Amino acid sequence: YKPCKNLVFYFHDILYTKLAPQSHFGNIIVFDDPITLSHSLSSKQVGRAQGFYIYDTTSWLSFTFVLNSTHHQGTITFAGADPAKTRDISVTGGTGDFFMHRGIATITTDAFEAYFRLGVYIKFFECW
Amino acid sequence: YKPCKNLVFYFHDILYTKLAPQSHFGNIIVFDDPITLSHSLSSKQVGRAQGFYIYDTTSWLSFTFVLNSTHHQGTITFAGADPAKTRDISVTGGTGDFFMHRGIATITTDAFEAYFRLGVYIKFFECW
Amino acid sequence: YKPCKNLVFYFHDILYTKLAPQSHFGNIIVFDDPITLSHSLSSKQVGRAQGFYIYDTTSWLSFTFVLNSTHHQGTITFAGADPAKTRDISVTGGTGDFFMHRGIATITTDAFEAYFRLGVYIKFFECW
């Protein structure tokens, strides 16, 4: 399938059978990260990535791109676990310009420092 | 677009570039709140709002309207971050009567006390 | 409606008006559980169930089936609260083979020990 809309953003984060069933107590890390048009942190910011993930002693990720720029106004929410420096995550929600949008995002992670840059390539397959 | 179904509920909660990337440890607050047809807490209850949000030292919200009334039987789930006394949040899931439903909700907050009344105006744009 | 695709999996977990508005601090339990084709833990594993739930002192559940088998390659994510030994939960996300899929799952719980087997019956009503 070809997507009815493609978007690319970067956001910047600073840290600080077979196997049996496995549980543990979790701790939540909450983040609020700048989203930029290109790779550099000092390139134009177009919103904030806000969400959370988990440490055990944690493939789980929930976050929203809160977009607020001259061309993009809305939110896109993603949720799920995926264990490669690259993973897919489902679009799970949309508001504003991204009202009723659906699709997937490919997340590529440049790890450096406590500095992580995440390339997020959004392919929408339903667009309103 | 005009919604194929509109619903209005209130639920009642009782408490107790630019910026750099920002993380912290989070704490979860879980809530289980009555949903009513109208503004007053003592008006007919039609279900419970059950979910969680986060304190840092937190625009993130995940919750489900568990509806159980003479006219509404099902669940509606919402998730996302939005930083106005009014915000939008995406429908992310539905069961029962709201099976395969999609759309957005506008949330208006009356803050008082530790008492918060939230007006939730659901506009579905896909209805089964 | 008849589903365009039906799937059945089991996963195995090992523990260890009216009512006023109710909140509390929550603690998160994270789990990573084997998914099998049939009831027995020693039957073929087809992936891992990875997500979290909450203890108060908690009908909330978020998890992803990370499927990795000879016939199924993708993820399916579910989220929501539902208070019966059986409950429904909405599909909220999909990737890979389950890209753009939507529907509901019925979850049946066999409680034993700290051992819980969950029968998950997925009915997709949108398939790509």
Residue numbers in the entry:
A (entry chain A), B (entry chain A), C (entry chain A): 28 to 43, 65 to 105, 110 to 135, 138 to 166, 169 to 184
Publication passage describing the model:
The entry point into presumed phenoxy radical-radical coupling to the 8–8′ lignan class involves one electron oxidation of the monolignol, e.g. coniferyl alcohol, which in the presence of a specific type of dirigent protein (DP; from the Latin dirigere, to guide or to align)2 (3), can undergo distinct forms of stereoselective coupling to afford either the (+)- or the (−)-antipode of pinoresinol (2a or 2b). DPs are involved in lignan biosynthesis, whereas dirigent domains/sites have been implicated in lignin deposition.
PsDRR206 structure was solved by molecular replacement and refined at 1.95 Å resolution. The structure of the PsDRR206 monomer can be best described as an eight-stranded antiparallel β-meander forming a β-barrel. Analysis of the crystal symmetry shows that PsDRR206 forms a tightly packed trimer, with the trimer axis being orientated along the 3-fold axis of the H32 space group. At the top of each barrel and slightly toward the outside of the trimer is a substantial pocket lined mostly with hydrophobic residues. In this regard, determination of the PsDRR206 three-dimensional structure, and its analysis suggests that the corresponding trimer has three identical substrate binding sites that are spatially distributed so that intermolecular coupling apparently cannot occur between two distinct substrate binding sites in the trimer model.
